[PDB]
Enzyme design. Sequence first.
Site, PDB file in Angstrom:
ATOM      1  N   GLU A  82       4.054  -2.106  14.415  1.00 18.58           N
ATOM      2  CA  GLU A  82       5.163  -2.631  14.711  1.00 18.58           C
ATOM      3  C   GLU A  82       5.705  -2.016  15.929  1.00 18.58           C
ATOM      4  O   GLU A  82       6.154  -2.679  16.817  1.00 18.58           O
ATOM      5  CB  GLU A  82       6.458  -2.934  13.844  1.00 18.58           C
ATOM      6  CG  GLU A  82       5.948  -3.758  12.681  1.00 18.58           C
ATOM      7  CD  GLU A  82       5.598  -5.255  12.964  1.00 18.58           C
ATOM      8  OE1 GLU A  82       5.386  -6.177  11.995  1.00 18.58           O
ATOM      9  OE2 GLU A  82       5.991  -5.662  13.986  1.00 18.58           O
TER      10      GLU A  82
ATOM     11  N   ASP B  27       8.134 -11.103  20.491  1.00 16.77           N
ATOM     12  CA  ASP B  27       6.967 -10.657  19.518  1.00 16.77           C
ATOM     13  C   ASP B  27       5.801 -11.151  20.085  1.00 16.77           C
ATOM     14  O   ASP B  27       5.622 -12.034  20.939  1.00 16.77           O
ATOM     15  CB  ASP B  27       7.527 -10.701  18.053  1.00 16.77           C
ATOM     16  CG  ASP B  27       7.204 -11.994  17.379  1.00 16.77           C
ATOM     17  OD1 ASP B  27       7.310 -12.287  16.157  1.00 16.77           O
ATOM     18  OD2 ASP B  27       6.856 -12.864  18.344  1.00 16.77           O
TER      19      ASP B  27
ATOM     20  N   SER C 133      -8.129 -15.103  -1.118  1.00 18.00           N
ATOM     21  CA  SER C 133      -8.078 -13.590  -1.022  1.00 18.00           C
ATOM     22  C   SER C 133      -7.468 -12.809  -2.244  1.00 18.00           C
ATOM     23  O   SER C 133      -7.709 -11.840  -2.413  1.00 18.00           O
ATOM     24  CB  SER C 133      -7.223 -13.307   0.036  1.00 18.00           C
ATOM     25  OG  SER C 133      -7.866 -13.890   1.251  1.00 18.00           O
TER      26      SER C 133
END
Length: 164
Positions: A11, A20, A117
């Site tokens: 980050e 962002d 997943s």
Amino acid sequence: MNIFEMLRIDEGLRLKIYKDTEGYYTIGIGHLLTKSPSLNAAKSELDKAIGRNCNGVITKDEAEKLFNQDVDAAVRAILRNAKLKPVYDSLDAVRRCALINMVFQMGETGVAGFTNSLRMLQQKRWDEAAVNLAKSRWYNQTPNRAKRVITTFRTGTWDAYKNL
């Protein structure tokens, strides 16, 4: 390496309000402020979060405090979530870090959406799961970060980050 160091690498740290990868107003270590287009709405959320008039800027300490809260909240969300908890419980320590990273980035809801997943990770079919995880908007939008996380699930080691 630990969850904090991992996320700090993914980050970054920014002490001034920034946008962002999705264009949203964020500050510190990936702390989303608002999805709202208004910088004013962002500055307001910021001040609410810190408990002072920050005028769009915070100190290192403040960033680290928000970070501690966010990590804690991500773990707590996994533990409270019926779809996530069982997977988390089944994983080893390194892989647990990979799931926490996804939750921190995309939210509980978003991660819980990766049904197939999740099932593969629970079954410990590492290679299959890595291939399934890559077929997502997440991977296409932030491929370098997704690859790091995916490699972590795949190998159960910190190799993808020992570089960085």
